[model samples]
Target: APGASIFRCRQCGQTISRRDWLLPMGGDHEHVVFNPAGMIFRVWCFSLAQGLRLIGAPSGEFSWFKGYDWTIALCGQCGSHLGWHYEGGSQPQTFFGLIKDRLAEGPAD
Candidate 1:
């Protein structure tokens, strides 16, 4: 279990470090993204429309799509690194991560 990667939960910001939370990425997912940087799997942030189409949003917190992925969505403006999108399916099957700043390794590029 520890051998597999983990991700950050977009909702509660919980750290998911189990194999259960990790999902197969890439073409299997509906989205396709080239990762020359070879980054790890994180979350899945969908547009309000996508998230709504798949799983209904929470009560009054609708439209808030910060809990999706961790990439692209960095900073308060991007809404807290949501997660990484997949390359095939419409939904992200994987979500796990390490706090980038925990080791004081400075911010990622």
Candidate 2:
């Protein structure tokens, strides 16, 4: 627990999650995806995250992960766009796909 990396919001330096929550997919924990508006985001997958609030109805359309509905995620402390919260996949899964550029890393407590 002492050495796990802490991920913080880049905008307000609020702790968002930790390296211990990392969940790999396709042999990797990171991914690059583009939205319908053609904006690309590099995100890291985690089984859980803190300091985030989900907005809007979960939508399955254009989901980067098949079968998972997504809701926009924002920083609860700073109201900054963080990423998306995903749920309702084939295995009843849930996770956070946090934007890489929106977070900073440091040692966890």
Candidate 3:
């Protein structure tokens, strides 16, 4: 156990998630997404995560993943914007799209 890489909030160094939670989306766990305003984000998909808080109402508009509603996810410990919590699709699903730059990988030490 704990062999998987640990991911922590870059701002506060709080453990947020682990590699065990990684989920593949569109055949890969990592994705490069672009918003309407042309902002690019490199995100990693995870089935679960801790030390994060969801904020704002979920909205389907401009969703990077079709049929999925997204809400802002912030670091629970330091309130730093981390990523987005997504839920929806025909079968009812949920996941976290964590910003790559917002997390630090490795041990908490």
Candidate 4:
């Protein structure tokens, strides 16, 4: 489990992307994102594969880490809301934090 994981959409079974040999941080990390619906997942660096779509305008939350902007990310195959694309203000890095429960993961062993 220290290697990459292929994350798929729960409803549609579309292959989004490999987590790219990246290990998810322990759940204790302070950056875990909690959606308004109370669902949560560990945050990862941003990378959108070919079959994903960004929906709606980006919204900013000033209370989360000095203000970051994000928009909902949907499965391009079946329109399932999967996660969000987050940008930390003017920083060059963006985070594609996916809801772990909403996605099905396959080990890339």
Candidate 5:
């Protein structure tokens, strides 16, 4: 801050508001595994609209609600525990209740 408390963007040198400057968030990560299947498998990283399904075999109480959700499998080539998309709904999603271990360090924005 010169006379007032404020910060500037390093890239554009734009004056960053307190809210804009605080946009970056970090936490315990939850990356999902994408079955390297077809085209649908190649774009899961593009959205947060997810649905769950069962795969393989597990009898008894495990008959439904697998440990994961949805059916898209695109990868974050940058390799972060985040499946990020800038489309649909109000806010960028962080998936739900569980976080898997397929996360890796992604490209620095």
Candidate 6:
């Protein structure tokens, strides 16, 4: 469920984003994202808020993956592995896919 409160970094105890920042795609499908040395498994697809500070190089080219440029997202409060955002190619829609295992559902402020 994409909402202002559903996705959060438990280590930081803060909500990094809101529902309005959400995009039109993602979720309901298992996604395998590449980071460099290995693949990252994620779920519940949605975009992120503009101000969310993140890590990872935006230029890791994975030719096997299509329509999405990969980037590792990090919690602003405490650096934690949240998931990744896929930048759509050829004019497709860009969005983020979150890791259910890494997120905590709690009150948003």
Per-residue lDDT tens digits for candidate 2, residues 20-48, read 88989656899999998999999899889
Q: Which ranges of candidate 5 are over 4 A from the true structure?
A: 1-71, 76-86, 92-99, 106-109
Q: What value of lDDT does candidate 2 attain over all alpha carbons?
A: 0.90
RMSD (Cα, Å) of model 1: 11.8
Candidates sorted on TM-score, descending = 2, 3, 4, 6, 1, 5
> By TM-score, is 4 or 5 better?
4
When 2 and 5 are scored with TM-score, the better candidate is: 2
The residue pairs found clashing in candidate 5 are: 51-70
How many pairs of residues collide in model 1? Answer: 23
For every candidate structure, what is the RMSD over all alpha carbons to the true structure, in angstroms? Answer: 11.8, 1.7, 2.2, 4.2, 13.5, 4.2
lDDT of 3 by residue, 3-70 (tens): 44899999998888888889887788899998888989999989898999899899999887777899
- Compare candidates 1 and 2 on lDDT and give the better one: 2
- The local lDDT score (0 to 100) that residue 44 gets in candidate 1 is 31
Q: Who wins the lDDT comparison?
A: 2
Among all windows of 10 consecutive residues in model 6, the one with the lowest summed lDDT is 20-29
Runs in model 1 deviating more than 4 A are: 9-14, 23-30, 33-79, 84-109
lDDT of 6: 0.58
Off by over 4 Å in 2: 1-4
Tell me the spans in candidate 6 whose CA falls farther than 4 Å from its real position.
1-5, 18-40, 63-65, 88-92
| Candidate 6 residue-wise lDDT, 42-92, digit = tens | 555665543245576564376333666768777666777676666755434
- Can you list the residue pairs that collide in candidate 4? none
lDDT accuracy of residue 74 in candidate 6: 71
TM-score of each: 0.22, 0.92, 0.89, 0.66, 0.18, 0.62
What C-alpha root-mean-square deviation, in Å, does candidate 5 show against the real structure?
A: 13.5
Give candidate 4's error at residue 108 in angstroms: 5.8
**lDDT score of residue 79 within candidate 1:** 42
Q: Give candidate 4's TM-score.
A: 0.66
